[PDB]
Each structure stands twice: as C-alpha cells, then as structure tokens.
C-alpha cells in the first residue's frame, strides 16, 4: 500500500483455452469458439494488443490473422471482433475492461484431414 510503488495493469488469471469441443455431431469448418478475459488497470492506460502466430497456417487468409491447428485446419483468431491481428484498448481511468479472443475454424477439403486439432498463439500487450 506504500503507494503500490507502480501503476499497473493485470489481465484476468484464467487459462486462455479456446475450446471447439468434439467436432463430431457438427464436425465443422466454420466453427466458432471464444474466451473473454478482463484487464484491470490502476492507472489510465493504452494497451496495444497484438497476436503473434506460433503454429503456421495451411492456407493464406490475406490480412486476417490465422494460426494452424494441424491436419487440414486453420483458426482465424480475432480480438474484440477484429480479424486483423491487432487492437488497442484504452482506459481513461482505473477500471477493468473485457478483451474477447475468438477462434473461427477454416478448412478446405482437399488439404483437410481426420485427427485432433491443436494450436497456439501469443497475445502481446505493448504498453507505452
């Protein structure tokens, strides 16, 4: 409490695991799942949120950010409803706001393939 020495932002603590369930009674391509986290800041803040691709996509999605999930499948990963790989949230005052990461499966048919899906991305928070 010694003047918390520093103003800070802290994201929500939950595991960020966007679950597409069993792809068996829908076994879907345009499948969507999401996870919302919150970020609580002590001070005003800008945070630039940037998705970093770890696993490479099978297809090209132009300016839409994607990650490969393996076999024939990609995920277009959105943040606060933006597919483009970047968003900025702004706090004028201390408070908390939500950030939603969405995952939309994409698979062709030619390149497709039967097995389990698994992918990863990094959400980078850049503070000025």
């Amino acid at each position: 409490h010694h003047h918390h020495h520093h103003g800070g932002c802290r994201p929500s603590a939950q595991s960020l695991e966007i679950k597409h369930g069993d792809l068996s009674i829908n076994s879907a391509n345009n499948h969507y799942a999401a996870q919302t986290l919150s970020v609580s800041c002590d001070v005003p803040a800008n945070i630039r949120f940037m998705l970093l691709r770890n696993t490479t996509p099978t297809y090209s999605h132009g300016k839409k950010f994607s990650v490969g999930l393996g076999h024939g499948w990609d995920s277009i990963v959105s943040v606060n409803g933006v597919d483009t790989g970047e968003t900025t949230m702004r706090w004028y005052k201390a408070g908390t706001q939500n950030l939603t990461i969405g995952s939309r499966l994409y698979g062709e048919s030619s390149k497709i393939q039967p097995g389990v899906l698994s992918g990863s991305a990094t959400l980078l928070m850049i503070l000025p």
Binding site: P11, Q14, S15, I18, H20, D42, V43, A45, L69, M125
Partner: protein, 216 residues
C-alpha cells in the same frame, strides 16, 4: 495468468541490480515465465549490457516471484548524461493443454525499461516533463525535450479533458530531442505525459508567438 507489477521500469544506474515482481495469479495451474531484454531497436540482447535473470522460471499455482535485472561492465559504454532505452519482456507459458480441439493463447508483455545513469538520478516524484516546449508548426506542434529523460506524451488538447480523452498518437521523445506532432491549434495547449509511476499528469501551457511553455 502471470502479471507484472509495473507498466515501465526505471533502472537506477547507481545500483548493480533491481527486481521486478511477478505473480502467477492462476490458482489452479503452474506457468513458466520467460523474461528477456531488448535494446532500443527491439533486438533481443542476451549478453548485456542489461540482462534479465532467470530467462525462464516456473511458478506454481498462486506463486509470486521475481525477475532480476542487472548490468554488465559494458554498461559503462552507454552515455552517462542521458537515459538509454531498453524493453523488458515477459511471456507466460501455460501448461498442456490435454483437451482436444483447442486454441491456446499465451500472454506476453512488453514494457519500456529506462536505463537511468547515476548522474541523472531523480528524487522521488521529481518532475522534469514541465520543461517540454511546444513549437507551433504547420499542422501541429514540434515538441522539444531538452531533458536527459525519455518523455512519453500521450495527450495534447485544448482543454484538460481533451488532453486526457482526446485522440492522440502517442509519441516518445528521446533525451534532448524534438519531434513534430499532428494537432489542431490550441489557444491554451494541455499536454498529458506518463511518469515513472505509470500515471498521467496534465500540464497547462501558455503560448507567446510560435512557442508555448508550461504555465508557471
């Protein structure tokens, strides 16, 4: 899951090292925390002159820990009458996951790390940002930073409220430099900047001709 205690770090060159607190706020799972340093050009640097240790550590559920920042002898080669810029990076590595059909997201944080040589050590809550000068230019202001510190300007408006909530393209001025900024012309400019603590004070400027300085 793994949070950092600050939005920027100031390394006091009077000291050989400092620590940043980190917390695994997830009470169910362990996370690794990767820490590393980048230079002013965002090149990852691993042998100094500023180093972060440990590069990776595991945090049990709920655990707090630390990252230690220290300098190598070659820190002496940096200028000693102004700050130098580095970036501190923290990336979490979550476990598993053992569920089928999942997209896993890891959080990473990138904050500014200011190496502040001993000669320009500051008193707590010292304010140098009121030394900024605004030059009226076609389409905005050229802001002069005559101080030995990096200054981050996050707002510029015609009122205090507009300095805080107005749309502005953040600019960081290097020590003893100047940068031109796009802006409406303001009869009485108000500027918001980010201090060591991470807060945003507002400064009121007065203009005479093409030059505005902090109302004293």
């Amino acid at each position: 899951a793994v949070s950092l205690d600050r939005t920027r770090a100031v390394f006091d060159g009077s000291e050989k090292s400092m620590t940043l607190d980190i917390s695994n706020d997830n009470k169910q799972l362990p996370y690794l925390a990767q820490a590393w340093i980048e230079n002013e050009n965002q090149e990852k640097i691993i042998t100094g002159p500023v180093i972060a240790t440990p590069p990776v550590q595991r945090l049990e559920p709920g655990a707090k820990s630390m990252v230690r920042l220290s300098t190598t002898p070659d820190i002496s080669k940096l200028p000693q009458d102004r700050e130098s810029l580095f970036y501190f990076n923290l990336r979490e590595i979550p476990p598993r996951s053992e569920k089928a059909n999942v997209l896993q997201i890891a959080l990473q944080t990138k904050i500014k790390l200011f190496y502040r040589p001993a000669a320009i050590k500051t008193r707590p809550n010292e304010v140098w940002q009121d030394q900024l000068i605004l030059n009226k230019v076609s389409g905005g202001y050229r802001i002069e930073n005559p101080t030995p510190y990096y200054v981050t300007v996050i707002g510029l408006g015609g009122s205090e409220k507009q300095a805080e909530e107005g749309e502005f393209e953040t600019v960081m001025l290097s020590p003893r430099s100047e940068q031109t900024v796009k802006s409406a012309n303001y009869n009485t400019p108000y500027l918001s900047y980010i201090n060591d603590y991470g807060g945003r004070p507002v400064l009121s400027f007065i203009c005479n001709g093409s030059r505005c300085s902090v109302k004293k």
